[PDB]
Structure 1
Amino acid sequence: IVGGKVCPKGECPWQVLLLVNGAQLCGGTLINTIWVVSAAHCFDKIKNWRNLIAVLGEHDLSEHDGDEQSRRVAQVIIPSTYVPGTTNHDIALLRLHQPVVLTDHVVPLCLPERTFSERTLAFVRFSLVSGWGQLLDRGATALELMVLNVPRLMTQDCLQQSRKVGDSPNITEYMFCAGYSDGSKDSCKGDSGGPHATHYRGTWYLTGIVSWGQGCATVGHFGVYTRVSQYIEWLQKLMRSEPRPGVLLRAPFP
């Protein structure tokens, strides 16, 4: 997270830290006791799924304080429409091997109904993005969980306000822009998969996933996030299904 601040311990309780062989891989969002939403691109280079661990209640990576809960990942579900190495349909649903225990430091973010998210949440201007990613473009990652308030843009406005790039990937209906174009605040690579959370009448909901950008906090550009509202039905159906052998599962989308 570039230009944000430390999320006071326990104030970003749905934040998940994904690790591969003990190394930081990506962020994620706990949506119930056994399900985590992350970004599909986070799994492009996995060779052995058994090395993947999800950690909840994490705050400071330098010390263990007893609130951390680690779980093996039993399943990683990705839309059939996602193509590794590309930007569209950047979402993954992870099933933990054992449920986490809800505590003051481990609480799920609400996955909203599609109508509520499209008719109402999509119009809440600011939302919080968080993670242990790079504090600066091409800089070191954070030791403490960081959080940042970012305003959402309608796609037409994002394109108009952004500077044109040749190889620049298209902003589809499965994405949305959020952030600032003055080069001061944005999420970054190491925050990939983390939550873009929206407040509405005293409750927080999952509206986006840190996905991509043309550099972090690049002047003239905005952060791009997976538009979670497009996947509500897809996620709900999967959560009602029985686990299947083999960690990675490509599921039909829609």
Structure 2
Amino acid sequence: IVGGKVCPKGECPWQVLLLVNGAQLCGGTLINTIWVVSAAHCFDKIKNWRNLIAVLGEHDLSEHDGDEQSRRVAQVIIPSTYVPGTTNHDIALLRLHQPVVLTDHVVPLCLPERTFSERTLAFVRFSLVSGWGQLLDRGATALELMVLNVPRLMTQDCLQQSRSPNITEYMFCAGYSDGSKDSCKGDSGGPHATHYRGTWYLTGIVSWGQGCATVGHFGVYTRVSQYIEWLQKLMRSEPRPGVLLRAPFP
């Protein structure tokens, strides 16, 4: 996160940190006690699936304060429509090996109904993006969880205002074009969370961009609304052997 602030401890309780061999990989979003939403692209270069760890209740990476909860990732589910090394359909559903325990510091973000998301949430200007990603383009990553308020753009507008992947219907733009504020590498898979009438909802997944906080460019986010039904169906399904699962989309 570029140009944000520290998310006060416990104020981002749905934020997940994904580790591979103890190394920072990506972010994620807790949507219930055993399910995490992330970005497909995060898992391209994964060698040994069995070394993937999800951490909940994380804040300051430099210390252990006992609010942290680590879980093995049992399943990584990616839509059939996702092509490795590209940006479209940038979503993953992760099944934890064991549920996390909900606490003051560990809470799921609401996965909204599609209709609600499309008709209402989509029109809420500002939303929060978070992660332990790069603080600057070509810079060091964050030790403390960072958060940033970003405004959402209609795609027509994003294209108009931008100055190379299309922005597809499975995406949306959010942020600023003045090079001051953005999500960055290391943040991907994390939440784009939207407030409505006292409750927060998952509307986006930190995905990609033309570099980080590049003048004349916006941050691009996976349009979660397109995937609600897909996600819901999967969450009702029995686990399958083997970590990686490609599931048809729609």
Q: TM-score range by the shorter chain?
A: over 0.9
Paired with 1:105 and 1:132, the residues of 2 have a C-alpha distance of 17
1:179 aligns with 2:175: yes
Determine the C-alpha separation between the residues in 2 that align with 1:194 and 1:87.
Answer: 15
Q: Deviations over 1:14-40 (max 9, x none)?
A: 000000000000000000000000000
1:69 positional shift: 0.1
Secondary structure of 2:232's aligned partner: helix
Cα distance between partner residues in 2 of 1:170 and 1:53 = 32
Distance between the aligned counterparts of 2:218 and 2:239, measured in 1?
37
TM-score normalised per structure 2: 1.00
In structure 1, C-alpha distance between the alignment counterparts of 2:159 and 2:211, rounded to whole Å: 16
Tell me, yes or no, if structure 1 residue 57 matches structure 2 residue 53.
Answer: no
CA distance in 2, matches of 1:222, 1:81: 24
1:89 and 1:189 mapped to 2: Cα distance? 18
CA drift at 1:194: 0.3
- What's the CA shift for 1:129? 0.1
Deviations 1:112-143 (A, max 9, x none): 00000000000000000000000000000000
Quote the Cα distance in structure 2 between the aligned partners of 1:4 and 1:121: 22
Q: How far apart in 2 are the matches of 1:36 and 1:156? A: 31
Q: Deviations over 1:62-99 (max 9, x none)?
A: 00000000000000000000000011000000000000
- Separation in 2, partners of 1:100, 1:187: 27
Q: Distance in 1 between matches of 2:46 and 2:149?
A: 31
Report the Cα distance in structure 2 between the residues aligned to 1:178 and 1:56, rounded to whole angstroms. Answer: 26
Give deviations 1:186-235, integer Å, cap 9, x for gaps: 00011000000000000000000000000100000000000000000000
Rounded to whole Å, the distance in 1 between the matches of 2:39 and 2:83 is 12
Match of 1:240 in 2: 236
RMSD (Å) for aligned C-alpha atoms: 0.2
Moved over 4 A (4+): none
| Alpha-carbon distance between aligned partners in 2 of 1:169 and 1:178, rounded to the nearest angstrom | 16
Match of 1:85, SS state, is coil
Measure the CA separation in 1 of the matches of 2:87 and 2:144: 28
1:227 aligns with 2:212: no
Aligned to 2:35: 35
1:205 lines up with 2:201 in the alignment: yes
Query: 1:246 & 1:27 partners in 2: Cα distance?
Result: 22
Q: Distance in 1 between matches of 2:47 and 2:11?
A: 34
Unpaired segments of 5 or more residues in structure 2?
A: none
Distance 1:151 1:24 in 2: 27
Query: What is the identity percentage for the equivalent residue pairs of Structure 1 and Structure 2?
Result: 100
Partners of 2:49 and 2:84 in 1: how far apart? Answer: 16
Residue 206 of structure 1: SS of its match in structure 2?
strand
| Equivalences, count | 250
Q: Give me the whole-angstrom Cα distance separating, in 2, the residues matched to 1:77 and 1:94.
A: 6
Q: Quote how far apart the aligned CAs of 1:252 are.
A: 0.2
**Which secondary structure state, in structure 2, belongs to the residue aligned with residue 232 of structure 1?**
helix
CA distance in 2: counterparts of 1:49 and 1:160, whole angstroms: 41
- Classify the secondary structure of the residue corresponding to 2:229: helix
- Determine the structure 2 residue equivalent to 1:48: 48
Partner SS, residue 230 of structure 1: helix
Q: Deviations over 1:133-158 (max 9, x none)?
A: 00000000000000000000000000
**Gaps (5+ residues) in structure 1?**
none
Distance 2:228 2:118 in 1: 11
Instruction: Using the TM superposition, give the Cα deviation of residue 102 of structure 1 relative to its aligned residue in structure 2, in angstroms.
Output: 0.1
- Give the SS at the match of 1:118: helix
Secondary structure of the 2:226 match is helix
Residue 198 of structure 1 aligns to a residue in which SS? strand
Tell me the distance in 1 between the aligned counterparts of 2:211 and 2:41. 16
How far, CA to CA, are the matches of 2:215 and 2:35 in structure 1?
36
For 1:41 and 1:148, locate their aligned partners in 2 and report how far apart those are by CA, in whole Å.
Answer: 22
